[PDB]
From a paper:
Like other coronaviruses, the spike (S) glycoprotein of SARS-CoV-2 mediates viral entry and also serves as a target for neutralizing antibodies (nAbs). Each monomer consists of noncovalently bound S1 and S2 subunits. Upon binding to the receptor angiotensin-converting enzyme 2 (ACE2), the S1 subunit undergoes a natural shedding process and exposes the S2 subunit to form a stabilized postfusion conformation. We report here the structural and functional basis for the distinct neutralizing activities of three nAbs isolated from SARS-CoV-2 convalescent individuals.
Residue numbers in the entry:
A (entry chain E): 333 to 516, 520 to 526
B (entry chain H): 2 to 131, 139 to 217
C (entry chain L): 1 to 214
Write the structure that this text describes.
């Protein structure tokens, strides 16, 4: 009957680049989901396969809280059956996804006046990610027949590009913090 | 490093056509790939995009009618065009896209033509003077092009052959003029030579006042 | 969506001077995506700039990208003859979009057009249609107005124009406007006039004929 460390995920001072998303495993605790829903500090809070209002009266064997930073534009891709450089090359939800997706603007916290290039995304990949795949490889992408061998140049490009975040970016180009809750043998997470 | 478009030709409205883009120097399945068209006297219009991983994206103008594909084994990007309209008449290019580094490799294009007309040889009418100017009016011909010389190629100085205009009829029309010293009008013969290979039509018209 | 508007539509200068082409996005836009392309007649585009400031390899020092936010600017410090082409900018949303293009043309002293009007040939009136051609010869700059008048009535919607490429010798343009009528409607009026307006003319020039007067 210990409470779940949702604060440690949502209120974390450092979030991760979406290519190397973080996954907090949640077990052996009670979680009040309506407490999040009624925060009302979220711009996206869209649940697939379940009701937000009906979440508290439920149990699951394990809960996963995946969290990262993308840009306004791209939040629409954190949902099932989606295409794009995020959905395809960084973070993919399965079609039978049955959790919730939560997001809020983080310009005040995640953008710098000089430009904040710490957050990154993967731009070049030969094929899509399987759902909940995590690709951290920084091998030089090979765009042509002759092989790169770790030397950039023509047809040989670094696969990761950087979000430049500036507070003066337009809304869609600003950083959003995203937490995906996946709902998954005896149980350990209830309300 | 090349991109070589094929497939382009003449099509009726509502018909279909498959453009090919044989690549070499970049492998098509490993890149973002684009079809960009340019209509006569107009700008570059992006038309379709395909991800390395297979996701596709289209312009609203061609959504539902165009489909972009490839063939890893032939290193060839395709564009299938259905339900073709008069407005899809353009020169179609494939480029490789590096998104952040631009489209750094382009093809010279294949030209697609969409119209409901049959081939018609041109009528040449004189444009008679009464510096002086006279000319030939090459009218009502499909399809393009025609070739206009003057005096079997001797006279070139002061010639203007104008870009054709496609009339309401779906038939082209052009003008070729020349400005000659006025005194010379009554000493020098001015014949323009019109040759329209599609219709097996060649004409030599004499322009006199 | 993103809408790029390029200004000016036509930039006119001479070799040696500095061209400053402008690209304006309809919303705030990422500088990582703003490419500049050059297109010369009959040729596929050439990438000159990527990001917003980076020269693609092979692109000479004259070319230089700047701008951020919504206003971007391509600069050619010291024009050369080969630099007189059309220039397109590009951005990226979920997919590419392009600007409408800026023309780079050679500046010249003003030159007024020679105007000429041609009545329809007797052969065509047999066929049952009348083309009335009006020619504007070797003028600069390219901006001219052709007003057809039939018996002093300004004619709208039965004409077509075309214009030649800027002449490689004297850097002028030439324009041909064709008025198309039926034989029947042609035979209903007398004076056919073509009134040309242009910067090299202090007041417009009208060339005209009278149907049926040798
Ligand atoms: C984050 O911290 C604030 C301030 O104490 C608190 O009110 C809020 O509930 C916290 N959020 C979570 C999810 O614990």
């Amino acid at each position: 009957t210990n409470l779940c460390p949702f604060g440690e995920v949502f209120n974390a001072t450092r979030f991760a680049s979406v290519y190397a998303w973080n996954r907090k495993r949640i077990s052996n605790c009670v979680a009040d989901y309506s407490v999040l829903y009624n925060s009302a500090s979220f711009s996206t809070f869209k649940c697939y396969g379940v009701s937000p209002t009906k979440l508290n009266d439920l149990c699951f064997t394990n809960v996963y809280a995946d969290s990262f930073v993308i840009r306004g534009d791209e939040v629409r891709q954190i949902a099932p059956g989606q295409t794009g450089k995020i959905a395809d090359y960084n973070y993919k939800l399965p079609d039978d996804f049955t959790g919730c997706v939560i997001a809020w603007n983080s310009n005040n916290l995640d953008s710098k006046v000089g430009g904040n290039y710490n957050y990154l995304y993967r731009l070049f990949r030969k094929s899509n990610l399987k759902p909940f795949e995590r690709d951290i490889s920084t091998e030089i992408y090979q765009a042509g027949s002759t092989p790169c061998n770790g030397v950039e140049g023509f047809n040989c490009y670094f696969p990761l590009q950087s979000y430049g975040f500036q507070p003066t970016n337009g809304v869609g180009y600003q950083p959003y913090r995203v937490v995906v809750l996946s709902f998954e043998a005896p149980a350990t997470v209830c309300g | 490093v090349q991109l070589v478009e094929s497939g382009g030709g003449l099509v009726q409205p509502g018909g279909s056509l498959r453009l090919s883009c044989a690549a070499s120097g970049i492998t098509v399945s490993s890149n973002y790939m684009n079809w960009v068209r340019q209509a006569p006297g107009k700008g570059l219009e992006w038309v379709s995009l395909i991800y390395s991983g297979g996701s596709t994206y289209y312009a609203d103008s061609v959504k539902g009618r165009f489909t972009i594909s490839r063939d890893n084994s032939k290193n060839t990007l395709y564009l299938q065009m259905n339900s073709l309209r008069a407005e899809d008449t353009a020169v179609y290019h494939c480029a490789r896209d590096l998104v952040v580094y631009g489209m750094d490799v382009w093809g010279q294009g294949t030209t697609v033509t969409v119209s409901s007309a049959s081939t018609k040889g041109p009528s040449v009418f004189p444009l008679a003077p009464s510096t002086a100017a006279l000319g030939c009016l090459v009218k009502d011909y499909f399809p393009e092009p025609v070739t206009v010389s003057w005096n079997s190629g001797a006279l070139t100085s002061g010639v203007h052959t104008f870009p054709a205009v496609l009339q309401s009829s779906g038939l082209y029309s052009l003008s070729s003029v020349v400005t000659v010293p006025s005194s010379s009008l009554g000493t020098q013969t001015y014949i323009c030579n019109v040759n329209h290979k599609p219709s097996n039509t060649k004409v030599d018209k004499k322009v006199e006042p | 969506e993103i809408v790029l508007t390029q200004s000016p539509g036509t930039l006119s200068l001479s070799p040696g001077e500095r061209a400053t082409l402008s690209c304006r996005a309809s919303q705030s836009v990422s500088s990582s995506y703003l490419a500049w392309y050059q297109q010369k007649p009959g040729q596929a585009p050439r990438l000159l700039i990527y990001g917003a400031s980076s020269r693609a390899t092979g692109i000479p020092d004259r070319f230089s990208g700047s701008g951020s936010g919504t206003d971007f600017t391509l600069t050619i410090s010291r024009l050369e003859p080969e630099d007189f082409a059309v220039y397109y900018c590009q951005q990226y949303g979920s997919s590419p979009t392009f600007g409408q293009g800026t023309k780079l043309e050679i500046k010249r002293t003003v030159a007024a057009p020679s105007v000429f009007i041609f009545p329809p040939s007797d052969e065509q009136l047999k066929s049952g249609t009348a083309s009335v051609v009006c020619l504007l010869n070797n003028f600069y700059p390219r901006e001219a107005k052709v007003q057809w008048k039939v018996d002093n009535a300004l004619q709208s919607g039965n004409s077509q124009e075309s214009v030649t490429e800027q002449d490689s010798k004297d850097s002028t343009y030439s324009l041909s406007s064709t008025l198309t009528l039926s034989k029947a409607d042609y035979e209903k009026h007398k004076v056919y006039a073509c009134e040309v307006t242009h910067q090299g003319l202090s007041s417009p020039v009208t060339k005209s004929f009278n149907r049926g007067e040798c």
